mmCIF file of C-alpha atoms in Angstrom:
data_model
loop_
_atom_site.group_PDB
_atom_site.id
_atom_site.type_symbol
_atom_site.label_atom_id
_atom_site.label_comp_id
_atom_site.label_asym_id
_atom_site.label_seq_id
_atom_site.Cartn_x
_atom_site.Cartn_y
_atom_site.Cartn_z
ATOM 1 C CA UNK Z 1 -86.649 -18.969 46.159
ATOM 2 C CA UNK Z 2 -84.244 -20.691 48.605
ATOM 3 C CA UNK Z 3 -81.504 -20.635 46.417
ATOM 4 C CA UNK Z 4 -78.229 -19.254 48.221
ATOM 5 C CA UNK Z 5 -79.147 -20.730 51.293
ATOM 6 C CA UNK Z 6 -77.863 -23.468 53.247
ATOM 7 C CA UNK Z 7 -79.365 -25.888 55.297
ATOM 8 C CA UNK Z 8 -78.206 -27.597 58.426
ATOM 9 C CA UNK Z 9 -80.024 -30.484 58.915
ATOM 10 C CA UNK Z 10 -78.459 -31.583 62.309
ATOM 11 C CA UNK Z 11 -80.205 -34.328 64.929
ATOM 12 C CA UNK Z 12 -78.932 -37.242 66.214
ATOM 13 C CA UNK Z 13 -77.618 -40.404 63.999
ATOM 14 C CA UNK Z 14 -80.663 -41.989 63.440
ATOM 15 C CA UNK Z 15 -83.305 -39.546 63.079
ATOM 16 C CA UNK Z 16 -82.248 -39.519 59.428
ATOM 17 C CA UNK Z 17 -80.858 -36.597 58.760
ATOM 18 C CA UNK Z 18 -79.873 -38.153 55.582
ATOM 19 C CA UNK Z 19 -82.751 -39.869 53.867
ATOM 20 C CA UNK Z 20 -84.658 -36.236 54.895
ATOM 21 C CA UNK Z 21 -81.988 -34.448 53.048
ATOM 22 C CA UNK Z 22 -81.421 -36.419 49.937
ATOM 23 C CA UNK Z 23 -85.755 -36.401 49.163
ATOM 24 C CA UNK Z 24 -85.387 -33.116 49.556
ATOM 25 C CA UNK Z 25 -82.174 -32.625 47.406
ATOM 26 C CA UNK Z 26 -83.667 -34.404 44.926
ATOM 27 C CA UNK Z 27 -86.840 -31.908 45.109
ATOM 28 C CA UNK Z 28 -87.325 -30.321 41.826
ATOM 29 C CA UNK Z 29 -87.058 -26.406 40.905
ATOM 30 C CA UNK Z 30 -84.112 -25.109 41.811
ATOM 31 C CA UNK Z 31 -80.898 -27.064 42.237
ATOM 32 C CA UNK Z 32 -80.039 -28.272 45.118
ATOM 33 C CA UNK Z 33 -77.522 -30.439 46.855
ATOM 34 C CA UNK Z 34 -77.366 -32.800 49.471
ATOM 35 C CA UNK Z 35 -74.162 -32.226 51.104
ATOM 36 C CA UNK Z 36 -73.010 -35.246 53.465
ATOM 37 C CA UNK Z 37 -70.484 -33.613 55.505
ATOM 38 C CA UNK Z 38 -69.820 -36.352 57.233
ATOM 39 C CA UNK Z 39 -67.796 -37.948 54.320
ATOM 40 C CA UNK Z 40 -64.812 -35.352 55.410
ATOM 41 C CA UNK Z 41 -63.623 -37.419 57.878
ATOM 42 C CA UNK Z 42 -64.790 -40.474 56.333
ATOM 43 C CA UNK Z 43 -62.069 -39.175 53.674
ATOM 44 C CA UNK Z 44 -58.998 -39.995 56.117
ATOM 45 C CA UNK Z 45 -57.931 -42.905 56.662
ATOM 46 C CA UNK Z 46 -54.908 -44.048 59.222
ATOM 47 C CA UNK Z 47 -54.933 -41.363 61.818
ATOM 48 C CA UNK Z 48 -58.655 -41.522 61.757
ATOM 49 C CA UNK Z 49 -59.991 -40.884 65.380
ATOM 50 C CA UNK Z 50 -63.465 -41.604 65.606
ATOM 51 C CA UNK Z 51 -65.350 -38.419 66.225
ATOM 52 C CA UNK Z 52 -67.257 -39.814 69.188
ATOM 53 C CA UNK Z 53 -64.172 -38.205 71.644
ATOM 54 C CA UNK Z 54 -61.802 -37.134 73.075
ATOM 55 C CA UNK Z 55 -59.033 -36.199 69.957
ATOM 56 C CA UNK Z 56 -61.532 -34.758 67.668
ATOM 57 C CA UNK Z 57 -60.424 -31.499 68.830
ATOM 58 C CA UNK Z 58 -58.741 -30.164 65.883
ATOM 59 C CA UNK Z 59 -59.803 -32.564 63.770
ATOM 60 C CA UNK Z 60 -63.426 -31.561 64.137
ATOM 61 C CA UNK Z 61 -62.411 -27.909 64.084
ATOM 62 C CA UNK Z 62 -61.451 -28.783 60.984
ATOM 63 C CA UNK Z 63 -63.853 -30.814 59.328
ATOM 64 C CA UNK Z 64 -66.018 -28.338 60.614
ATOM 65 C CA UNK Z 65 -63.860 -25.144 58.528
ATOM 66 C CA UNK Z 66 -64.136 -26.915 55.470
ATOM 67 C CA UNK Z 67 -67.621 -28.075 55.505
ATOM 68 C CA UNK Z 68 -68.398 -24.396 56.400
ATOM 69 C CA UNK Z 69 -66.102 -23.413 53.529
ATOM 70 C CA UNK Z 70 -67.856 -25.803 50.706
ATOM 71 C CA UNK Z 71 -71.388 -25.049 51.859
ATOM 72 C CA UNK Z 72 -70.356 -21.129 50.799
ATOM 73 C CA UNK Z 73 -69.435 -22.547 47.404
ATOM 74 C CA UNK Z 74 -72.040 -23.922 46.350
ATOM 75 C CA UNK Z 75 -74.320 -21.227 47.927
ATOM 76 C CA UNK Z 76 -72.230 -18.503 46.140
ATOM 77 C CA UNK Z 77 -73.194 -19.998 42.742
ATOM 78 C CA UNK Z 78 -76.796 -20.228 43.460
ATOM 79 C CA UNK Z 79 -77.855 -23.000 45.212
ATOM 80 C CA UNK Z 80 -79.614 -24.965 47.633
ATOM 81 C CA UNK Z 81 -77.181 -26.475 50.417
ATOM 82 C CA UNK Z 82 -78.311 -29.288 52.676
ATOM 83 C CA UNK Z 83 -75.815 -30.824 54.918
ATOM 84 C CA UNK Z 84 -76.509 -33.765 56.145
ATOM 85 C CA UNK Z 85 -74.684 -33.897 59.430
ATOM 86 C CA UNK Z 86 -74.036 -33.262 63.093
ATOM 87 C CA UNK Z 87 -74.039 -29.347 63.805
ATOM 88 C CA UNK Z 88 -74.268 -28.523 67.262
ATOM 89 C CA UNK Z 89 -75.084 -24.412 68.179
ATOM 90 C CA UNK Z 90 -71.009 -24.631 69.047
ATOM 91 C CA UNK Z 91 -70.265 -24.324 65.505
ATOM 92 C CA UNK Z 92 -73.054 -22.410 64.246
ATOM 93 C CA UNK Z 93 -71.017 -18.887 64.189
ATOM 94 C CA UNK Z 94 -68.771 -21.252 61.657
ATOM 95 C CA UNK Z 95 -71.737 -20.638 59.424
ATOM 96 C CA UNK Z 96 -72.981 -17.617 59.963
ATOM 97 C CA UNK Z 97 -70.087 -16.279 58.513
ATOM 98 C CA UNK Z 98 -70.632 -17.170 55.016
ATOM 99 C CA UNK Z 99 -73.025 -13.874 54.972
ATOM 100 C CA UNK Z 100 -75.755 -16.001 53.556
ATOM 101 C CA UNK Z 101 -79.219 -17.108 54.678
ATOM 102 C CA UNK Z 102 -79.118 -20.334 56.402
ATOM 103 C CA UNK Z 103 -81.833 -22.296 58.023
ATOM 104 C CA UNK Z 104 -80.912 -24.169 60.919
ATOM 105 C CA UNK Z 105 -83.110 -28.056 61.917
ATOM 106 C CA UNK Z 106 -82.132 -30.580 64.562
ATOM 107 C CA UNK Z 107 -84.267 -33.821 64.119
ATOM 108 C CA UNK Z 108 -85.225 -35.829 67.426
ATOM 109 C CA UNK Z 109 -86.841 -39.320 67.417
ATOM 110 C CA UNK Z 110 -87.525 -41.828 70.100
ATOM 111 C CA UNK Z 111 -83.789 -43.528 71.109
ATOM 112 C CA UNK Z 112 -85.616 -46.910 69.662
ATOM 113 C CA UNK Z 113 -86.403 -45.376 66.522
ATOM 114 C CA UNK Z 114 -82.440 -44.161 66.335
ATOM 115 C CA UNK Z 115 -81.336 -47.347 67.618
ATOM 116 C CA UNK Z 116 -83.381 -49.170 65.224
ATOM 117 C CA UNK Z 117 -82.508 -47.442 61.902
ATOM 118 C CA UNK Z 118 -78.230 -47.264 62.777
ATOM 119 C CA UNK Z 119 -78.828 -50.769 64.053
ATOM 120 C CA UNK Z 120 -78.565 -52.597 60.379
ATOM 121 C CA UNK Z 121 -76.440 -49.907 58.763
ATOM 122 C CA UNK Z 122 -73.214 -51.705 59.419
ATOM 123 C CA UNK Z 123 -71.304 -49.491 56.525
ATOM 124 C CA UNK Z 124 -69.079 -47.534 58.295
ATOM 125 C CA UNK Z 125 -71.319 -45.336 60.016
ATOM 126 C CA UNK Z 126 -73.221 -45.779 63.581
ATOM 127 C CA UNK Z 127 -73.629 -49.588 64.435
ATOM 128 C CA UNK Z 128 -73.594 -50.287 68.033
ATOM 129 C CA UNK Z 129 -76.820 -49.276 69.625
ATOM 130 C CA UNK Z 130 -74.813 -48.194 72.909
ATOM 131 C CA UNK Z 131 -73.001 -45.382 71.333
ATOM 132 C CA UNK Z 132 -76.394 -44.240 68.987
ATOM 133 C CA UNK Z 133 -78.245 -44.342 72.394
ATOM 134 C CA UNK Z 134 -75.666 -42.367 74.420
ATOM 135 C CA UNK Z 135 -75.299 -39.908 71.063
ATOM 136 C CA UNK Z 136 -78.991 -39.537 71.288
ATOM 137 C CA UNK Z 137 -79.248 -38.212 75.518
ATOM 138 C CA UNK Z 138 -76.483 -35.996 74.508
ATOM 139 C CA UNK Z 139 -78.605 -34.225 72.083
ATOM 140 C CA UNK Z 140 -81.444 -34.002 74.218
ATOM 141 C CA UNK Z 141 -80.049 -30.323 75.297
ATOM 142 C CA UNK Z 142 -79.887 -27.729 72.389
ATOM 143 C CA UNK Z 143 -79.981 -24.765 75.375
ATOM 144 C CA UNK Z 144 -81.553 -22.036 73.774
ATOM 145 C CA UNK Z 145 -81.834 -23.824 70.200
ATOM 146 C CA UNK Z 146 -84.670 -26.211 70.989
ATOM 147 C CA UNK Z 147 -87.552 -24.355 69.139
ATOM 148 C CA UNK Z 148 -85.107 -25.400 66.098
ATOM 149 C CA UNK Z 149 -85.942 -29.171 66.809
ATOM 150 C CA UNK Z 150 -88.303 -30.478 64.853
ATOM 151 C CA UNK Z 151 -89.600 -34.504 66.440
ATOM 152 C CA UNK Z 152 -90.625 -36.865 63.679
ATOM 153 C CA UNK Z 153 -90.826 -39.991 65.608
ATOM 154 C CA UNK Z 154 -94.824 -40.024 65.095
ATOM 155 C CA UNK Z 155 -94.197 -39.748 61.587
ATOM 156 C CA UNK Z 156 -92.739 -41.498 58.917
ATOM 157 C CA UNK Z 157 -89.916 -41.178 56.036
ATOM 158 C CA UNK Z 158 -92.631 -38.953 53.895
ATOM 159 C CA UNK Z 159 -94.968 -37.216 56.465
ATOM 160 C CA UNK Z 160 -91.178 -36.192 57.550
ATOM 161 C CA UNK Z 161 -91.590 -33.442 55.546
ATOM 162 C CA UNK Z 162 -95.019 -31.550 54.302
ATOM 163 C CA UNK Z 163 -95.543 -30.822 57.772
ATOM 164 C CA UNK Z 164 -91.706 -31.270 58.871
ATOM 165 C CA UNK Z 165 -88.868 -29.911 57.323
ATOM 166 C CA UNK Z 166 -90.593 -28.710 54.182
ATOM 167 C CA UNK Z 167 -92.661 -26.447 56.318
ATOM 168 C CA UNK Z 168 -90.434 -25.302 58.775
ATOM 169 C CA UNK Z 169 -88.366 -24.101 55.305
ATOM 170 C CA UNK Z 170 -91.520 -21.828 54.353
ATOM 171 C CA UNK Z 171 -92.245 -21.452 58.088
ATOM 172 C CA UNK Z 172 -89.382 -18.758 58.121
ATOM 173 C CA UNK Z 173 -87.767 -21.337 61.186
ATOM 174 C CA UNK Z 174 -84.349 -19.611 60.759
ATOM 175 C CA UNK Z 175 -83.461 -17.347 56.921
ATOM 176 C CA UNK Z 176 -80.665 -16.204 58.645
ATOM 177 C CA UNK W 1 -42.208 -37.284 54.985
ATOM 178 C CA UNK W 2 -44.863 -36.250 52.695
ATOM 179 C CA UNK W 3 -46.762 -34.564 54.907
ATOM 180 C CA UNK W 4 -48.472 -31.303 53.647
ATOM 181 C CA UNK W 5 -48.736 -32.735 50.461
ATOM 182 C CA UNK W 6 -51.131 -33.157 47.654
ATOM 183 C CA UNK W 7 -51.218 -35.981 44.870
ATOM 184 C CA UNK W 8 -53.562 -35.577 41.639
ATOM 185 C CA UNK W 9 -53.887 -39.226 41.158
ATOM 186 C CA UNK W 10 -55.481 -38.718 37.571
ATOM 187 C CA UNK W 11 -56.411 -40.972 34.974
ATOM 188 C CA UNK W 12 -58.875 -41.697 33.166
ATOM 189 C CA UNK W 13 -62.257 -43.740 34.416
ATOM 190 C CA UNK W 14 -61.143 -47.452 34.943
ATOM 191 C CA UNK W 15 -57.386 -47.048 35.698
ATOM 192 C CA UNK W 16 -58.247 -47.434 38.870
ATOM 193 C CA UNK W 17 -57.392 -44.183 40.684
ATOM 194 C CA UNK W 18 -59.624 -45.245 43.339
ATOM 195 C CA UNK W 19 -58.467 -48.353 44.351
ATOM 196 C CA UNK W 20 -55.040 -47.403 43.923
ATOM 197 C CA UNK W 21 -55.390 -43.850 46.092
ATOM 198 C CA UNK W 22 -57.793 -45.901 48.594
ATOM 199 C CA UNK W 23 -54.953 -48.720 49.131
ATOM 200 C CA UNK W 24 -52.414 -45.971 49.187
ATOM 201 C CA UNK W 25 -54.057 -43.713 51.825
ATOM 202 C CA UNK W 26 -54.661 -46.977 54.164
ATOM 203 C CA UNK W 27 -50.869 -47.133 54.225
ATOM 204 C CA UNK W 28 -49.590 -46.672 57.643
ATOM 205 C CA UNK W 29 -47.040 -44.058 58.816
ATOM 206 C CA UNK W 30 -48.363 -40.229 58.610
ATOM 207 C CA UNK W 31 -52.014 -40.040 58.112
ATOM 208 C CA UNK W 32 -53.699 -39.601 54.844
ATOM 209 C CA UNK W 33 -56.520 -39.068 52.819
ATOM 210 C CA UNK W 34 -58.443 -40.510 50.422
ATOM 211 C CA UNK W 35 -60.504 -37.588 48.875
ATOM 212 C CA UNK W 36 -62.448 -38.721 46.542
ATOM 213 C CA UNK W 37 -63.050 -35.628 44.522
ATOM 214 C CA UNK W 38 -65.851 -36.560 42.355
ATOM 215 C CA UNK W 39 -68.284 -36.724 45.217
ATOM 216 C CA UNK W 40 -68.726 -33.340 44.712
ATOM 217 C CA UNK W 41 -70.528 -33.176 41.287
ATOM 218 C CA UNK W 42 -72.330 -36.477 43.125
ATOM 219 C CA UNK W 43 -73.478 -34.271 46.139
ATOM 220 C CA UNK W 44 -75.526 -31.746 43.329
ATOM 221 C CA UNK W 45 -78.838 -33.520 42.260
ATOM 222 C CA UNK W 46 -81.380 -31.874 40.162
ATOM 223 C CA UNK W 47 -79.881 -29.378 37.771
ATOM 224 C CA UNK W 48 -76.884 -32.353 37.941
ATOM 225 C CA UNK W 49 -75.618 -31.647 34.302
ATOM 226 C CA UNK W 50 -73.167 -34.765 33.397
ATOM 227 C CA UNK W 51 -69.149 -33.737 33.542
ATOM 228 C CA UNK W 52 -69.108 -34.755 30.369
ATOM 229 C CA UNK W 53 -70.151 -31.753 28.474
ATOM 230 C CA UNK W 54 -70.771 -29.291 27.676
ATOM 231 C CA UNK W 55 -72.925 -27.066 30.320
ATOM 232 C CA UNK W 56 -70.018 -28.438 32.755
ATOM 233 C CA UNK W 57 -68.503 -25.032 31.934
ATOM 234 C CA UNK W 58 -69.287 -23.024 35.371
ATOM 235 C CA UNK W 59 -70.286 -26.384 37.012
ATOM 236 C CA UNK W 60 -66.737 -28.173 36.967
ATOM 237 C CA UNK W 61 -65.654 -24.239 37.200
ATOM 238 C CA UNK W 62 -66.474 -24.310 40.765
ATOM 239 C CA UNK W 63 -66.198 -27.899 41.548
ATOM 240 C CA UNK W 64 -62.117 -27.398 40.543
ATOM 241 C CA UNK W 65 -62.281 -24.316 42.760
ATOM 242 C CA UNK W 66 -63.939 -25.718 45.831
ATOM 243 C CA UNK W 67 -61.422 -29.332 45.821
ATOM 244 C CA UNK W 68 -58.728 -27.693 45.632
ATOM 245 C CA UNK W 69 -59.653 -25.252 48.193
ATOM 246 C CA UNK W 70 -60.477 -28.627 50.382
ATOM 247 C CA UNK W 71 -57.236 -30.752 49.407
ATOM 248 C CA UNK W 72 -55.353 -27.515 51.093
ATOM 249 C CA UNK W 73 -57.364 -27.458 54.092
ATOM 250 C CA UNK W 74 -56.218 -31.015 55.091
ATOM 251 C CA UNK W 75 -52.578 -30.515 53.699
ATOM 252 C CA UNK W 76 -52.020 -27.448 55.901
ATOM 253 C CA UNK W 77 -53.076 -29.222 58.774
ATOM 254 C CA UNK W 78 -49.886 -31.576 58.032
ATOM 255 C CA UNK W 79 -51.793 -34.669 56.242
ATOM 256 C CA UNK W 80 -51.347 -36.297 52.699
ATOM 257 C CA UNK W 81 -54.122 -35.966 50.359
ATOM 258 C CA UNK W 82 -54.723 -37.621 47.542
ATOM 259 C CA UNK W 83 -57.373 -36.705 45.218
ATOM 260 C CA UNK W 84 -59.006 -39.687 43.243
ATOM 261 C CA UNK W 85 -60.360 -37.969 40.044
ATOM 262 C CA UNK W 86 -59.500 -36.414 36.879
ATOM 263 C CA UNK W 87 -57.542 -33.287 36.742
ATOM 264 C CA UNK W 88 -56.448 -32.152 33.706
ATOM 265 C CA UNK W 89 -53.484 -29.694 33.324
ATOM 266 C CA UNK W 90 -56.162 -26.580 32.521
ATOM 267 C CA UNK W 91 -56.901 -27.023 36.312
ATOM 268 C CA UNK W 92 -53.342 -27.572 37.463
ATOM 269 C CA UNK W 93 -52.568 -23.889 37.850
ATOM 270 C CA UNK W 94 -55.687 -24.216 40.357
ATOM 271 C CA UNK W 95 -53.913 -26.624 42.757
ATOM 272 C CA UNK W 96 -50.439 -24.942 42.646
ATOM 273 C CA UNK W 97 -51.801 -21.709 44.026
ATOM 274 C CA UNK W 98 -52.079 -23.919 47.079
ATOM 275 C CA UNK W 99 -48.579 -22.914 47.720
ATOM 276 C CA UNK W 100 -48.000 -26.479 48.668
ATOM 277 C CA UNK W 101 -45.585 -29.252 47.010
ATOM 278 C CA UNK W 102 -48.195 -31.542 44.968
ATOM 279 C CA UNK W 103 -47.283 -34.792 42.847
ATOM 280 C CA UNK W 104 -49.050 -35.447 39.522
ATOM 281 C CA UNK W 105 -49.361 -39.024 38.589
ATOM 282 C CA UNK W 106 -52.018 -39.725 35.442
ATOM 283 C CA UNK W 107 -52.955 -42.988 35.236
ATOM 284 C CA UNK W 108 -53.372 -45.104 31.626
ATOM 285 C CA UNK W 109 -54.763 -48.377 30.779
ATOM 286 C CA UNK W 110 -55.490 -50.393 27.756
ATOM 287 C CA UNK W 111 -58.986 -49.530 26.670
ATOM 288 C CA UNK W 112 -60.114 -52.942 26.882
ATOM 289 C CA UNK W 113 -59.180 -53.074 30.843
ATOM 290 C CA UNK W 114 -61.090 -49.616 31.283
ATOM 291 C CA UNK W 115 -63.995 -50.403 30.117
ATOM 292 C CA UNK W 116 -63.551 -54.141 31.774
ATOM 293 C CA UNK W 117 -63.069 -52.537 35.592
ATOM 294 C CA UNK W 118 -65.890 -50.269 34.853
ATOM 295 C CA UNK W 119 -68.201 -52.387 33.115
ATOM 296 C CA UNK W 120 -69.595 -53.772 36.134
ATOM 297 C CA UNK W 121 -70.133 -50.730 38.462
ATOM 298 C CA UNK W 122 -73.179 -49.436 38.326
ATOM 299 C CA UNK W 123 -74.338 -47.138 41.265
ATOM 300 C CA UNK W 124 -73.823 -44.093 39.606
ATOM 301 C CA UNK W 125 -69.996 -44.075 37.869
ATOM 302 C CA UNK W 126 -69.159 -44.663 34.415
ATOM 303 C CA UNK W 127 -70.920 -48.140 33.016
ATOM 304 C CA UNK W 128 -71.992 -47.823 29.005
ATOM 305 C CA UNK W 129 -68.488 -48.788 27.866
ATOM 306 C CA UNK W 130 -68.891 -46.081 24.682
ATOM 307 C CA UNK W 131 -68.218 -42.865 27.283
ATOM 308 C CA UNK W 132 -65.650 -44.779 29.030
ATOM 309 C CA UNK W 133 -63.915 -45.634 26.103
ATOM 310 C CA UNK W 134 -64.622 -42.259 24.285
ATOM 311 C CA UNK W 135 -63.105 -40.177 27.575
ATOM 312 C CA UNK W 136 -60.618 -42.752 27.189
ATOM 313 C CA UNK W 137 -59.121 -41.821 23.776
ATOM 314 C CA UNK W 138 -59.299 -38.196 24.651
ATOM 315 C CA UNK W 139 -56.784 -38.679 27.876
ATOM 316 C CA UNK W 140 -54.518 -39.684 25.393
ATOM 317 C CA UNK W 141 -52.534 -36.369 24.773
ATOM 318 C CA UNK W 142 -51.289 -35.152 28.042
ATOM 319 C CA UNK W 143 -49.730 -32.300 25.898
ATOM 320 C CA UNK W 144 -45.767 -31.619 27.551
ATOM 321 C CA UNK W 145 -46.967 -33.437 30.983
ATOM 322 C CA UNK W 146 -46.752 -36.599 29.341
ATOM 323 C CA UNK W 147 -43.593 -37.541 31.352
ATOM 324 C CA UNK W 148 -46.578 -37.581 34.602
ATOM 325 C CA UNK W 149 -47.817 -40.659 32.898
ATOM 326 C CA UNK W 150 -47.636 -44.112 34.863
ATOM 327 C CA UNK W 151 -48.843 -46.811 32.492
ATOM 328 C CA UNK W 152 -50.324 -49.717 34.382
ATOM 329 C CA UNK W 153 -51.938 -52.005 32.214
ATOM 330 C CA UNK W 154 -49.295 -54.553 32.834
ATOM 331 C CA UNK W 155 -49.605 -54.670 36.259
ATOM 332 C CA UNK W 156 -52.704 -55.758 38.490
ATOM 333 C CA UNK W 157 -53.530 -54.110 41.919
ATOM 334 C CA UNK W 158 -51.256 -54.480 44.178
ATOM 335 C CA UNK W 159 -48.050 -54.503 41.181
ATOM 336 C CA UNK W 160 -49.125 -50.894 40.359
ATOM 337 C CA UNK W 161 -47.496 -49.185 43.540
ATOM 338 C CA UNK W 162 -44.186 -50.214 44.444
ATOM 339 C CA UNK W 163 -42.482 -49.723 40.997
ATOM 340 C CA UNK W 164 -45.638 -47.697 40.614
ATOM 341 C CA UNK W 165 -47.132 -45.080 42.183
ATOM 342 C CA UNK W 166 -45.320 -46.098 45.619
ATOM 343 C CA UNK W 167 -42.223 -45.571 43.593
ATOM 344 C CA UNK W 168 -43.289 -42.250 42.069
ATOM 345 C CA UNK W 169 -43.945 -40.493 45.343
ATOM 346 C CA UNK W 170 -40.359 -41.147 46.118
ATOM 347 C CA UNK W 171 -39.033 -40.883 42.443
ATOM 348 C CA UNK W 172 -39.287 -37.031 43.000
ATOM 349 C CA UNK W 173 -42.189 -37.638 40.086
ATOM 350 C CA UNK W 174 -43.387 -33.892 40.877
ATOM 351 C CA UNK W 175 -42.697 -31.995 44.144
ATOM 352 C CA UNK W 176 -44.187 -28.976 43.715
#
């Protein structure tokens, strides 16, 4: 019944924002889709800037439009959009404006826990443990958004979910 | 110079559109992008429905609409794109109405070296050599755009650029 609705399945890298999104993408019933996001500025290459700071001012902005823009699409047709990204409250009003329901979860885990799962990831994505760790204090302050965190460190990749994410869907944690 | 642009870097599976759009978007001087279009039929899981055929009717529908809404959002923010996937001239009409100058380059390859570059790829791209070599024969008849066709079968890697693609871009293959 969640079809038309997106997902933003924000939280630090680390807390797996990812492997939560995917298990859940691949849920059966209605079709879904697990949207990495991130892969739209993975998708340049030579003028790059590492989203970290300070230049990802308009390239974020962006990112960010488009993202906004392809999560409608799919949600238009029926759907069940997950992205699997980085979606701070700043850019929330990006999504709001697709006049569709959309349920909003920031995952939080222990800075060891994030640390530990970046830490052999190598890829492309978040290696160093410095920059995870300093990532991770950042998002320690979602201002009037924290009752849309939802802490899995005493948990693991499936209890992440029954009485995580797959509840807070039911739970009503954000329709719109 | 070819900022703002778009480039359909077509073909069909095993000419390598990837590694040549990939190599090509690494190239220094204005920054590019490798979009590698197909990740967006990859992002849908459960309900997938193979691009092959047929229910790919609304699916690919919508998965035209949505890249080439996406390959504008980085070209009007001065940038190169270049799609890596197949885009037949039914969709072209769906990229031109991106009132921005895009190149068309189709790639061909012998059979034998399409099925041979895809043979061993797994993951979740073409492998049983029968599809490849069945969507093979079909990109055959480019109808009245065969003059877009860059035959690389007698070149390797890095011989199908400079009096390939490299030389296309320049060759005023197709502006706009």
């Amino acid at each position: 019944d969640l079809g038309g609705n997106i997902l933003l399945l924000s939280g630090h890298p680390g807390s797996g924002k990812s492997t939560i999104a995917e298990a859940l993408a691949n849920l059966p019933g209605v079709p879904k889709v697990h949207f990495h996001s991130d892969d739209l500025w993975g998708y340049i290459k030579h003028g790059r800037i590492d989203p970290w700071l300070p230049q990802s001012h308009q390239q974020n902005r962006m990112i960010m439009q488009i993202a906004a823009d392809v999560a409608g699409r799919y949600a238009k047709e029926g759907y069940f959009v997950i992205l699997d990204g980085v979606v701070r409250p700043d850019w929330l009003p990006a999504f709001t404006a697709l006049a569709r329901p959309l349920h909003y979860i920031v995952l939080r885990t222990t800075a060891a826990e994030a640390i530990e799962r970046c830490l052999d990831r190598g890829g492309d994505s978040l290696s160093d443990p410095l920059v995870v760790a300093d990532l991770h204090s950042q998002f320690a302050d979602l201002g009037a958004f924290e009752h849309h965190v939802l802490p899995v460190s005493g948990k693991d990749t499936d209890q992440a979910l029954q009485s995580a994410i797959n509840a807070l869907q039911s739970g009503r944690f954000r329709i719109d």
